[PDB]
Paper text:
Ca2+-free calmodulin is attached to the γ-subunit in a compact conformation and interacts with both the N-terminal region of CRD and KD. It assumes an “antiparallel” wrapping around the αJ helix, with the C- and N-termini of αJ anchored to the N- and C-terminal halves of calmodulin, respectively. Calmodulin encompasses the majority of the αJ helix. Specifically, Lys125γ and Arg128γ in the αE helix of the kinase C-lobe form bonds with Asp57δ and Glu68δ in the second EF-hand motif of calmodulin. Moreover, Tyr291γ, Arg297γ, and Phe299γ in the C-lobe–αJ linker contribute to the interaction with calmodulin by interacting with Ala11δ, Glu12δ, Lys14δ, Glu15δ, Phe17δ, and Phe66δ. Together, these extensive interactions effectively tether calmodulin to the γ-subunit.
Phosphorylase kinase (PhK) phosphorylates GP and transforms it from the inactive b form to the active a form to initiate this important biochemical process. The α-subunit serves as a bridge between the β-subunit and the γδ subcomplex, and facilitates the γ-subunit to adopt an autoinhibited state. The γ-subunit bears the catalytic activity and consists of an N-terminal kinase domain (KD) and a C-terminal regulatory domain (CRD).
Residue numbers in the entry:
A (entry chain D): 4 to 148
B (entry chain C): 12 to 382
C (entry chain A): 1051 to 1223
Write the structure that this text describes.
Amino acid sequence: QLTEEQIAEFKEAFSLFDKDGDGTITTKELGTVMRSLGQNPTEAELQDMINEVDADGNGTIDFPEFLTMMARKMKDTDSEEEIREAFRVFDKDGNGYISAAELRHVMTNLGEKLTDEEVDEMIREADIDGDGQVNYEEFVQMMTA
Amino acid sequence: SAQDFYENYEPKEILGRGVSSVVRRCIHKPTSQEYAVKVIDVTGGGSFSPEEVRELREATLKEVDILRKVSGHPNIIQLKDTYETNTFFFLVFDLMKRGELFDYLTEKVTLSEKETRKIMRALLEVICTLHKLNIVHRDLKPENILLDDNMNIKLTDFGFSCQLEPGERLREVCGTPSYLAPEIIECSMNEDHPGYGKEVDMWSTGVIMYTLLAGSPPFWHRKQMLMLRMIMSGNYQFGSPEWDDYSDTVKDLVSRFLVVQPQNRYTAEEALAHPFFQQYLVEEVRHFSPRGKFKVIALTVLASVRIYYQYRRVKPVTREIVIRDPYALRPLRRLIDAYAFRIYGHWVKKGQQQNRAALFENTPKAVLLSL
Amino acid sequence: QGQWQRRRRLDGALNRVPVGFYQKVWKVLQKCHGLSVEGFVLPSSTTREMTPGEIKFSVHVESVLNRVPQPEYRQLLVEAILVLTMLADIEIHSIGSIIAVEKIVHIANDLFLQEQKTLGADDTMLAKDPASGICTLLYDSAPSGRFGTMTYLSKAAATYVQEFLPHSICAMQ
Ligand SMILES: C/C=C(\C)CC/C=C(\C)CCC=C(C)C
């Protein structure tokens, strides 16, 4: 039921996770990402974290494995918390509105260089209510979509 | 002749046993390469009447045929050559140092998601080759599945297989009871149903999924016919606490093979197209609309946040949770299953009265003794 | 009698034990002072006295395990011993005292009693074994599962460690 699209979205997310084109995401790589997004967990934490997802995998997450997590295993509460968390991860300001520049802040963090207008467009494409901001309601509506 | 057998191979040790067929390891003298030989006693110690003696040969003569129709394929054994005598029928094939999947499933009670994926990835890709050549197996049990030192699946015992004429559907009941598709029994209990086709293998493969990931058959109970009504009706449950820890992508693909109606079953070609068996090919452009990019970056965040959240959730093992409910949480439940199969792993064998589900009690005694 | 009652009267009457169980009792006894069955102790002094692989040690563990006459109860003791072994690995601390392998089955019989009463078992189905004191259904119960014999014995192998070990730390899951 995950569409060709959805599977593809999970795949590009897996790409954003691994800088090396390893075909795997290492404990170190995840880390580079979490710190990229500002959550700096213990190298040990990471080991456990990659372990919870894989259990064999020697500290590397794989994509077939990755999708397994990104498929909505999440409970409404569980996802809700998460959906919320990302949203915060999105707003360093924590103002509660998604800056076009804030989107850039995240990408810049994930090392993807994308056009400035395109970014505005990214929000604009998805933006009706928040002209220039994606409201959280927009975010949740969007994720399910 | 037997001289032709010993001019090329020399049997060293006994590898396995069967009802009338014995698997024996051999050395190929010209090549010094390890090979397995299955040694079927045609006369069967005198118990076989001339009909069964003839029928076993015709079954064996047919058996060479299918194994001669499929060759060079990575995940089915290669019948290197076959020798027939008046009292035996020798078949030499590849040596699999490790035993059947049943023996492996006994060692590891619950087989992990990563391991089963390539296991069946081969099996489904095995199933594609059989269906493309139009040959059904009707016998896809894990004891029919052999594994090598790299864990690669070698589907074995196409003893019950038969090539359907284009658009023909069989009626004979061939197969041990648990792994029989619903219309197998229905054709056994009715004449109107004109038969079953190549979709039979899909149900049997989907059964391995429930057995490998949970250590029990989807439908099992100690009397014979009761299992059958669970099959044709199709009452299966991803029961708790066992089946809740696995990812949701597992469940849907299990139901697809387990649908009772054959035409709606999930054929092998599209079976490999379900999200589980999708593979990460590094060199993909993967172009996306600006909404598509925004999801990816959001999903990339949503993933990282998720992984931290899921882990934070795992409850360390404490004294109390052991007292209240051991099975409920994964690490202790997998342990109880593991030391369940170390004590009574000899009590699991092939058949109905020796299946793995006999080692699991997932229902209250009262409901078990309700009728 | 029953399926597993015939698979436990055939598993504890032949003294069939899993591979390395005699090599696993050695590890557990080093974390304890002994292992008592029907009030016959197998002390930790045996661990130093014979090696884990010594067959003389296998006799000592075996000799203690035939202090129960009924075969089916012995296998209950056998897998009860292993649920200490698997709980011993998780627990960092040592109990430092005697453990009655028999009792762990008994409250496991008692705790097997309570759950079935709550779920709808009648007094008829939960009938006592005349000599052992275990429910006949517990003998027939499967090893693993939500309501298996070694889930209740993985359950009662913790309440006994409650009284002997006031504080416990479980790690490595
Ligand atoms: C983590 C275990 C939790 C409840 C069970 C209690 C464990 C024990 C009570 C002692 C038995 C064995 C010891 C080997 C050293």
